[PDB]
Amino acid sequence: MLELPPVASLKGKSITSAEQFSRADIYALIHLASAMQRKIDAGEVLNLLQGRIMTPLFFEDSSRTFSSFCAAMIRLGGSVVNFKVEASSINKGETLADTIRTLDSYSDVLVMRHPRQDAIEEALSVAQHPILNAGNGAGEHPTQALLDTLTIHSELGSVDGITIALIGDLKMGRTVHSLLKLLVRNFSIKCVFLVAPDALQMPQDVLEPLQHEIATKGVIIHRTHALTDEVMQKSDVLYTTRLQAKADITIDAARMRLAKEKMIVMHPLPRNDELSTTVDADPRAAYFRQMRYGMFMRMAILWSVLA
Amino acid sequence: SMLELPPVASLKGKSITSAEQFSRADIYALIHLASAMQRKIDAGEVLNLLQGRIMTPLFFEDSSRTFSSFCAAMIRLGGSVVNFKVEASSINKGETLADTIRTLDSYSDVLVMRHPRQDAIEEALSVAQHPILNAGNGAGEHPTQALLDTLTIHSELGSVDGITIALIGDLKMGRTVHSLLKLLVRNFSIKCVFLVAPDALQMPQDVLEPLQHEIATKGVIIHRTHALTDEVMQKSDVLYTTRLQKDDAAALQSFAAKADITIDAARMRLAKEKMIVMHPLPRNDELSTTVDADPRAAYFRQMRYGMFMRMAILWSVLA
Amino acid sequence: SMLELPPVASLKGKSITSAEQFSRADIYALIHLASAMQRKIDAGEVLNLLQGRIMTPLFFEDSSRTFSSFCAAMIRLGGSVVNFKVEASSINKGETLADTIRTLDSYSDVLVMRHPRQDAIEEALSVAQHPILNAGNGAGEHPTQALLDTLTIHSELGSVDGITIALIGDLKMGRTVHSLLKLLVRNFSIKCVFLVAPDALQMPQDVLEPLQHEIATKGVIIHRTHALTDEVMQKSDVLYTTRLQKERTSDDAAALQSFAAKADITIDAARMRLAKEKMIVMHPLPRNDELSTTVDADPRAAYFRQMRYGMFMRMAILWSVLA
Ligand SMILES: NC(=O)N[C@@H](CC(=O)O)C(=O)O
Ligand SMILES: N[C@@H](CC(=O)O)C(=O)O
Ligand SMILES: N[C@@H](CC(=O)O)C(=O)O
């Protein structure tokens, strides 16, 4: 439509990493996501992907990611074939490759989540249709990064210039890896606080490939093992994560007394006690809204890929 | 069309938690709407009333009828289902009930929840922006079973006022009989209710006491029995029986009474010519297969009514 | 302008339990219809033929191709699927098979049933109002597999009559080879069938005897071996090999042992050097090491294209049953 033009660059293409997107890619998707959101909240009913099929291939469990993918597909008028791993012909000795080839025979796109990092590369090698990396081990989670970025944009108004805190298990947290990559390559970030005990800090295999962009844009990088008052007062985003002593990163109503008036708290979810329920009532808690921005970002993605 | 399938306005955008929330007029509007739903589906007509709306099942215990009929009802309105699991979720990585509700709520137009705890429903409500349809909360209620059950009685017998009905089996833990007693007693002039169970599994006081005014104003007879006596067999228009749901004395009393509360072809010889056997299902041997060929065996038709009655509910909720 | 999708009339309103219930004419008609399904779906066209119709899977043992393929096919006709799970259902409270059939039959227009008991499909039939498609009954039959297997031979080789076909591997428990042998011998002029299997896993007498009349009357040569001889490799137009059906205890052990121990049935690039230029390798799937990944590059490897054929054969089956 004039109203919902797909993002041309994403057509017919798998999504494995946040590295594959340009700054233009992200904003085209953001604006497309906002258009999708306005049409849906009005009660408009899209038939954009009628006759098209997504198949989830989840070798690890998910609540959100599965559900937001499916809902996104459906709200575009597309369909889902409900493949399960536990009740499948994997049990009879079949291999990942043959499994992938199989669902490929029937589908227009695959959404894959897997505990091994290099499993996705293997899926690409045998797949004809697009695969969307919905999480590869401790590797990446690219579409979360995109929707995270939509959230920041939509809530605060700009992504350029922000100071962001990445909190929790940065070592194994695939969300924070895609997010860092996405933000630093495609925006001008003031400062990034990496908040974690040393054991779970942001890995070098993430930081080093970003170093040129970090340096060239003059982005500040500080490591702390705590949510110190400096982190609380300066951050426009507190993005915190699950584990995969804890007092020094927990965010509660009290801690929130030190935050600015114009900032948000975000969490890819699910959460443990790092993010107290005391916070939920605060208009700065955007971690529930995040999931709805998720659905619309995923509509944008699916449409752009399959248009 | 609003001529053919007028939704039931009172149900617009509201959660369904109890049989207590409905009025007589509500139950009748839903009955007539379900029957109209049925006449269309049976004639091959396709409906598109709910294109682009999503129903998410949220089932923490097993189901065959209620899951499936809900999914089928939604599809037959042209709506969609997101097949969310609890066993294949991030509830494994330490996620709580409210967070789970707030999640599915981001995506859905209506939620359908079955949960082993009674209070699990009131907890979900407090955080949900979208209607939740209670598909069973522990041993509490199963309000939409009560509605399809009442649909069954009405379509098969022709009237609900004036009936004698026996509720049979595990009445303690049977959320089906809790909701069905409340809905009939509160909204119809029931002649007699037989409560057929051993003491250990009798109908709970917390169901019966809230009904005392209805019971006295409408003059309903309530008799407890521990057996399907000849009286109960000869006088009942509806025999509605239930599985025994699996502390020590309950097991035993159930063992002591099982043959007395079992319905089989032999027992049906004492039944009226016009009456019905019902069972929300699933069943064990409290209801013999020997009864399945009898015209009064209404427990299979019962399921189909469920789909059509849930079509009426879904459409009225989301109109 | 476009192709018609006439339903195959004789399938209307009927259960599919066995390869035996099909005539040659039904097979070609379904084949042709599946090809027109193919050309429509691959052209991007959106089918709305079975809107408002419901398919319910009633799988009492694992499946990937078959479950997924049926759901896809239903979706691509404009139909819908109620994702009922046997393992997470009221059977875990003692519900019978029949009550479970009657349950889903209450909501569905068609049931796709797979079950480890040979006779369970029979149980199901006796109570279901709506058609049931047998998607696997123990070690019995797998009749939609046979139909797609035949599609795959037709589209790939150009003819089914006149072919020499090897059925290899676990022929005793292999429901797929059971239905396919029956379906080929009763409706086509097969030149020769090689039965490549160790003695313990050979093709059973309860499949071979009912076909005796047909085999003799039509001159169908039948050769048993326990190895992929050079003869078998050199003469065969189709190498349809199969997985050892482990899921199906001391003769049991010797039967498991026999596949690779009294073997020589592995197919790999080395064995393939001996094959015709014009031939195909098929495997209904999943595979184990009987079908090496070294064959996958070979254009003669048809076992992936087979799963695609199968979706289209299945769209054809479902439209014909439900139109
Ligand atoms: N976004 C998700 O779907 N989950 C995250 C967050 C987490 O699981 O901790 C992940 O690690 O994949
Ligand atoms: N399934 C119904 C009745 C039963 O289980 O026997 C319920 O649990 O409400
Ligand atoms: N998948 C096929 C073959 C096999 O399982 O080996 C069947 O179920 O019969």
Residue-by-residue DSSP string for A94-161 = --HHHHHHHHHHH-SEEEEEESSTTHHHHHHHH-SS-EEEEEETTS--HHHHHHHHHHHHHHHS-STT
Q: What is the distance between the alpha carbons of residues B8 and C138, in angstroms, rounded to a whole number?
A: 48
Measured in degrees and rounded to the nearest 5, phi and psi for residue C240 equal -105, 100
Give the bridge partners for C239, in sequence order. Answer: C166, C281
Burial class (CB in 10 A: 0-12, 13-18, 19+), B9: exposed
Q: Which of B48, B49, B58, B64 to mutate to test the interface with C (most CBs of C within 10 A)?
A: B64
Closest CA to A191 of A233, A157, A226, A150: A233
The preferred substitution site among A133, A167, A169, A174 for testing ligand 1, maximizing ligand atoms within 8 Å of CB, is: A174
Q: At A27, which amino acid appears?
A: Y
* Residue having the nearest C-alpha atom to atom 9 of ligand 1: A242
Tokens coding C147 = 């139909």
Which amino acid is residue B207, in one-letter code?
V
Q: Which ligand is nearest to the CA of C245?
A: 3
B222's enclosing H/E stretch is: strand B221-225
Ligand 1 binding pocket includes A177 (Cβ within 6 Å):
no
Measured over the CA atoms of residue B278, residue B284, residue B285 and residue B286, the dihedral's sign is negative
CA B32-B38-B41 angle, to 5 degrees, is 145
From B108's Cα to the closest Cα of chain A, the distance in A is 8
| Chain breaks in chain C following residues, C–N > 2.5 Å | 248
User: Do residues C193 and C221 touch, judged by C-beta distance below 8 A?
Assistant: yes
CA A128/CA A216 separation, integer angstroms: 38
Q: Is C164 left (phi over 0), alpha (psi -120 to 50) or beta?
A: beta
CATH class of C142-309: alpha beta
Is C157 in a helix, a strand, or coil?
Answer: helix
Q: How far apart are CA A241 and CA A263, in angstroms?
A: 17
The amino acid at B175: R
Q: Which two tokens stand for residue A50?
A: 């009628």
* Residue positions counted in chain B: 319
Nearest to residue C240, comparing CAs of C308, C181, C314, C321?
C181
Does any ligand 1 atom lie closer than 6 A to the CB of residue A68?
no
Handedness of CA C130, C50, C313, C187 (dihedral sign): positive
Q: How would you label A56-71 residue by residue, b for 16+ Cβ within 10 Å and e otherwise?
A: bbbbbbbbbbbbbbbb
Query: What is the number of the ligand 2 atom nearest to the C-alpha of B170?
Result: 6
Within 8 A by CB and 6+ apart from A222, the residues are A191, A192, A193, A194
CATH 3.40.50.1370 fits B4-141+306-319, yes or no: yes
Task: Give the residue from A40, A266, A294 showing the smallest Cα distance to B106.
Answer: A294
* β partners of residue C281: C239, C301
Instruction: Determine the longest span between alpha carbons in chain C, in angstroms.
Output: 63
Chain A / chain B CB contacts < 8 angstroms: 78
Q: A83 at the B interface (CB within 8 A)?
A: no
Contact B168, B261 (CB under 8 A): yes
Distance between Cα B282 and ligand 2 center (Å): 6
CA distance C319 to chain B (A): 15
Which residue out of C85, C106, C322 would a mutagenesis test of the B interface target, given it has the greatest number of B Cβ atoms within 10 Å?
C106
Fold of B142-305: Rossmann fold (3.40.50)
The partner residue sitting opposite B107, judged by closest CB among A46, A62, A295, is A295
Burial class (CB in 10 A: 0-12, 13-18, 19+), C260: middle
List % helix, strand, coil for chain C (3-state, nearest 5).
Answer: 45, 15, 40
Mutate to test the pocket of ligand 2, among B68, B281, B287, B299 (most ligand atoms within 8 A of CB): B281
Experimental resolution (Å): 2.4
- Could you list the beta-strand ranges (E) of C92-241: 110-115, 132-137, 164-168, 192-196, 221-225, 238-241
Return the amino acid letter for A148.
Answer: D
Rounded Cα–Cα distance for residues B200 and C142 (Å): 50
The tokens describing A6, both together, are: 């797909």
| CA distance readout (Å), A42 to A3, A45, A50, A69 | 14, 9, 20, 21
Show the tokens assigned to A227: 């949510």
C205 in contact with B, Cβ within 8 Å = no
Q: Confirm or reject contact between B212 and chain A (CB < 8 A).
A: no
Q: Among residues B253, B232, B234, which one has the least CA distance to residue B170?
A: B253
Domain boundaries, chain C: 4-141+310-323, 142-309
- Give the Å distances, CA to CA, from B275 to B145, B165, B224, B287, C181: 20, 10, 20, 16, 53
Peptide bond into B282 cis (omega under 30): yes
CA dihedral B143, B144, B149, B151 (to 10 degrees): 120
Structure tokens at A17: 């990493």
Alpha-carbon gap, residue C140 to C172, rounded angstroms: 9
Q: Which residues of A touch C243 (CB under 8 A)?
A: 92-93
Q: Which residues are bridge partners to A113 per DSSP? A: A58
Which amino acid appears at position C318 of this protein?
L
Label the pairing between strands C238-241 and A220-224. unpaired
The helix (run of H) or strand (run of E) holding residue A75 is helix A64-75
Count Cβ neighbours within 10 Å for each residue of A277-295 and write b for 16 or more, e otherwise: eebbeeebbbbbebbbbbb
Contacts of B62 (CB under 8 A, 6+ apart): C88, C89, C90, C92, C93
Cα separation, C69 vs C253, in Å, equals 33
B78: Cβ contacts below 8 Å, ≥ 6 apart: B46, B47, B48, B49, B50, B51, C52
Contacts of B154 (CB under 8 A, 6+ apart): B31, B160
DSSP designation for C225 = E
HSE-CB at B107 with a 13 A cutoff on CA atoms is: 34
Enumerate long-range contacts of A198-203, CB under 8 Å, 24 or more apart: A198/A225, A199/A171, A200/A168, A200/A169, A200/A170, A200/A171, A200/A172, A201/A170, A201/A171, A202/A166, A202/A170, A202/A171, A202/A176, A202/A177, A203/A170, A203/A171, A203/A177
In terms of Cβ atoms closer than 10 Å to its own Cβ (0-12, 13-18, 19+), residue C199 is exposed
Q: What single-letter DSSP state applies at residue C302? A: -
Q: How far apart are CA C239 and CA C222, in angstroms?
A: 15
C52 touches chain B (CB under 8 A): yes
B82 CB neighbours in chain A (<8 A) are 67, 70-71, 74, 80
Selection from B225, B226, B211 nearest residue B179 by Cα? B211
**Could you tell me how many residues make up chain C?**
323
Angstroms from B122 CA to nearest CA on chain A = 18
Comparing CA positions, the residue from A159, A114, A164 lying closest to residue A140 is A114
d(CA A295, CA A143): 10
Give yes or no for A292 touching B (CB within 8 A): yes
Q: Does domain C4-141+310-323 have CATH number 3.40.50.1370?
A: yes
Pick from B277, B269, B270: nearest CA to B295: B277
User: What is the rounded radius of gyration, in angstroms, for the C-alpha atoms of chain C?
Assistant: 20
Distance CA C263, CA C226 (A): 6
The tokens describing A61, both together, are 């469990």
Which of chain C's residues have a Cβ under 8 Å away from the Cβ of B64? 84, 89-91, 95, 100, 103-104
Phi, psi dihedral angles at C32 (to 5 degrees): -60, -45
**Helices C143-157 & C175-187, crossing angle to 10 degrees?**
60
Residue length, chain A?
A: 307
CA distance C297 to B147: 60
- Determine the Cα–Cα distance for residues C48 and A51; give it in Å rounded to an integer: 9
Cα–Cα distance between B159 and B146 in angstroms, integer? 15
Counted across chains B and C, CB pairs separated by less than 8 A come out at 74
Contact call for residues C214 and C255 (beta carbons, < 8 A): no
The residue assigned the tokens 């959404």 is: A111
- Say if residues A53 and A106 touch (Cβ distance below 8 Å): yes
Residue A303's closest CA among A64, A95, A86, A39? Answer: A39
Token pair, residue B222, equals 């309530």
CA gap C15, C13 in Å, rounded:
7
Q: How far apart are CA C188 and CA C182, in angstroms?
A: 10
A71, B108 Cβ separation under 8 angstroms: yes
Of the listed ligands, the closest to the CA of A243 is: 1
The shortest C-alpha distance from B65 to chain C (Å) reads 7
Put simply, the answer to whether A75 touches B52 (Cβ < 8 Å) is yes
> Which residues from chain A sit within 8 angstroms of residue B94, using beta carbons?
242, 270, 272
Contact A251, A240 (CB under 8 A): yes
C82 closest CB neighbour out of B47, B63, B72: B72
Contact C62 A88 (CB under 8 A): yes
DSSP state of C213: H
The C-alpha atoms of residue A2 and residue C46 are separated, in whole angstroms, by: 22
Q: Which contiguous run of DSSP H or E holds residue B205?
A: helix B205-208
At the fourth CATH level, which superfamily is domain A141-293? Aspartate/ornithine carbamoyltransferase (3.40.50.1370)
Structure tokens of A149?
A: 């970025």
Which tokens hold the place of A36?
């999708």
Sorted by sequence, the CB contacts under 8 Å of residue A212 that are 6+ apart come out as none
CA–CA separation, B15 and C86 (whole Å): 29
What order of strands is seen across the sheet that includes strand C164-168?
C221-225, C192-196, C164-168, C238-241, C280-282
List of residues 6+ apart from C249 with CB closer than 8 A: none
Task: Tell how strand B164-168 and strand B192-196 pair up.
Answer: parallel
**Neighbouring C-beta atoms of residue B53, cutoff 10 Å:** 21
Find all residues with CB under 8 Å of B230, minimum gap 6, and list them.
B270
Q: Look at residues B303, B312, B269 and name the one whose alpha carbon lies nearest to residue B283.
A: B303
Q: Which residues contact A304 (CB under 8 A, 6 or more apart)?
A: A6, A7, A8, A9, A10, A11, A29, A32
A1-140+294-307 and A141-293 in the same fold: yes
- C67 close to B (CB below 8 A): no
Quick check: C107 and B283 CB within 8 A? no
Asked if B54 contacts B79 with a C-beta cutoff of 8 angstroms, the reply is: yes
**Omega prior to C286 cis, within 30 of 0:** yes
- Decide if C3 touches B, using CB distance below 8 A: no
The contacts of residue B139 (CB under 8 Å, 6+ apart) are B118, B172, B173, B174, B175, B178, B245
CA distance C107 to B71: 9
What does each C-alpha distance from A109 to A46, A284, A285 come to in angstroms?
19, 36, 33
On whether the CB atoms of residues B253 and B199 are closer than 8 A, the answer is yes
Q: How far apart are CA C104 and CA C121, in angstroms?
A: 14
Q: Write out residues with Cβ below 6 Å of ligand 2.
A: B 136, 142, 175-176, 242-243, 280, 282
Helices first, then strands: H and E counts in chain C: 12, 9
Cβ contact, residue pair B307, C88, below 8 Å: no
Give me the amino acid identity at A238. L
Contact (Cβ atoms closer than 8 angstroms) between residue B186 and residue B179? no
Residue B96, C-beta contacts closer than 8 angstroms, at least 6 positions apart = none
Q: Does the distance separating the beta carbons of B90 and A270 come in below 8 Å?
A: yes
Token look-up 């015709």 returns C276
* Sequence-distant (≥ 6) Cβ neighbours of residue A258 within 8 angstroms: A229, A232, A233
- For residue A280, the 8-state DSSP code is T
Ligand 1 center–CA A52 separation, angstroms: 27
Angstrom distance (rounded) from CA C49 to CA A53: 17
Breaks (C-N over 2.5 A) in chain B follow: 246
- Cβ neighbours for C112, distance < 8 A, ≥ 6 positions apart: C55, C56, C57, C58, C59, C66, C67, C70, C132, C133, C135
CATH 3.40.50.1370 applies to domain A1-140+294-307: yes
